[PDB]
Design a protein around this ligand. Structure first.
Ligand code: CL
Ligand code: CL
Ligand code: CL
Ligand code: CL
Ligand code: MG
Ligand code: MG
Lengths: 318, 318
């Protein structure tokens, strides 16, 4: 395995420039591999159309993506119809793994998607990217297709200069990973939605359902394949999204919850509830967010249960 | 028995500074014979400490509340010392106080050492970098210590100029971490606030973490010492934001994480932190690894900060 974070960073970081699309396509045909691109799509009517159009144009020059799969996460904006009218295979998430109830977020979408992905490789992609450059499709395929032993590949990129990622990455994930999962500290965008692996890998791990999904995947893939089999590819620039700091806070909470849950399974965290601490203070699903408003201080409460899906292998018709 | 919930505490222990007219506070302070020291941990703040001291003096004219003003200077290159002295504050070098401990390890070291020169029954910590120092920044948090019996420790609450739950580190690191591991603290609007007051005995009876981890350690240790019902916060109105770079915030977030981790390890909630099989080269809590994307490629950068716990100053000074 890798000797240190730094040795991994050196051996397992690439630029998209090292994998021209033509070459990859040649290689893929040679390997006899297929690729499903999965777009978990929640109210992305203004963007999925463009992404699908670009994947299509890419496939013109170099056939790399076999299945374009949009999973509509109960959108109210016309997402499903936009995706459909641009030629993607579209599924509502309610209709997949239907015995599971209704959509419980990005993770649930990404997980359920596996039941209809046909490719040997599953490439997850963010559906909300505003100017989708071809390399957001193929860049991460580079190392899975060409480097022995590499099994999982994450995007790295920068906003429009030293980009350590968005705010949840910078202030929640990187700090927690440095402390608890030092092997993950070399990833530039550990929470990126573009990543690819063998379909079998994804079918064999649990998926956290909400925002914590990328966090749980990073940790579980690490434990499964080892750091040496993980890589990242510099894809250049990505206009980061805008969001309200107030809403990032609950996303940060999910990241925390995911680490805490994994720490508890490893046995590093035990007796999470402090003996002495009254029951009334203890409710993990209950997030309190104290704020100051022009009208006084207020205690806001958010209730989100941390739902987790089992390895879909265990639960899908074989 | 204490508050039965964070919401119960939030109602009973949150105040507005309007509830504590300074002249009323001054009377009660006089009646009890209490003195107050104001401690300003100062690193390169020549442009702001002048006003702060000035304003504190102006407030004492209407209502004597601060008996001693201590500027503890981190050997600023900007003439902080001269400014503060000429404005009539007492000035001390952080490296001269408690010098047997060597040179100072950042903000927390300076705050701890100051306890060797504060003579006040009560110690009020204040930010030295505030641009517009309003009167209530000097008296607001004194309200409950003085007027509410049972209350020993009071934290500032405030908003930036619809719903302010704090700066990025507070929002994305502290609140998430406290919600999970220290739910008793989730009602604090500004848990990492630099301005807060307690009795000197209390401060002398707890360790201080050095560096940026100090505010976190204090919250957790005060909580354990006196209980939630003895803590309060007071809304102080509008506080200007001092904005900084998302990169540098990452190191600060990591200090919050480190402070929580250490307390968890000491309680026994966290154990066997270094996973077995993880090569020694990966495990170094003082080394923060910060992966970034630059226009010249991906870069793994590294920040080193030794975390030091100063003992309760009572154990040093008999
Ligand atoms: Cl859990
Ligand atoms: Cl839950
Ligand atoms: Cl430690
Ligand atoms: Cl250390
Ligand atoms: Mg809770
Ligand atoms: Mg380290």
């Amino acid at each position: 395995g890798p000797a240190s974070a730094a040795e991994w960073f050196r051996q397992r970081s690439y630029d998209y420039g090292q994998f021209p699309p033509e070459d990859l396509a040649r290689r893929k045909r040679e390997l006899g591999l297929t690729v499903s691109a999965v777009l978990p799509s929640r109210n992305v009517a203004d963007t999925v159309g463009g992404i699908i159009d670009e994947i299509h144009a890419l496939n013109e020059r170099a056939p790399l993506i076999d299945q374009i799969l949009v999973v509509d996460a109960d959108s109210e904006d016309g997402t499903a119809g936009v995706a459909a009218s641009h030629g993607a295979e579209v599924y509502s998430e309610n209709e997949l793994m239907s015995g599971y109830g209704d959509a419980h977020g990005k993770g649930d979408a990404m997980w359920r998607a596996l039941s209809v992905t046909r490719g040997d490789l599953v490439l997850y992609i963010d559906a909300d990217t505003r100017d989708f450059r071809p390399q957001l499709a193929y860049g991460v395929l580079g190392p899975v297709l060409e480097v022995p032993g590499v099994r999982f590949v994450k995007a790295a990129y920068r906003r429009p200069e030293e980009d350590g990622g968005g705010r949840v990455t910078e202030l929640t994930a990187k700090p927690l990973f440095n402390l608890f999962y030092p092997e993950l500290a070399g990833f530039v965008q550990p929470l990126a939605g573009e990543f690819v692996a063998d379909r079998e890998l994804f079918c064999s791990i649990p998926f956290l359902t909400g925002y914590a999904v990328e966090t749980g995947i990073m940790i579980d893939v690490l434990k499964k394949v080892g750091l040496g089999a993980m890589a990242q590819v510099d894809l250049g620039e990505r206009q980061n999204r805008h969001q309200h700091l107030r809403d990032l806070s609950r996303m940060s909470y999910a990241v925390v919850r995911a680490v805490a849950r994994r720490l508890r399974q490893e046995g590093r965290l035990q007796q999470l509830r402090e003996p002495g601490l009254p029951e009334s203070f203890f409710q993990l699903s209950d997030y309190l967010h104290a704020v100051a408003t022009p009208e006084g201080l207020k205690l806001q409460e958010y209730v989100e249960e941390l739902v987790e899906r089992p390895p879909i292998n265990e639960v899908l018709r074989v």
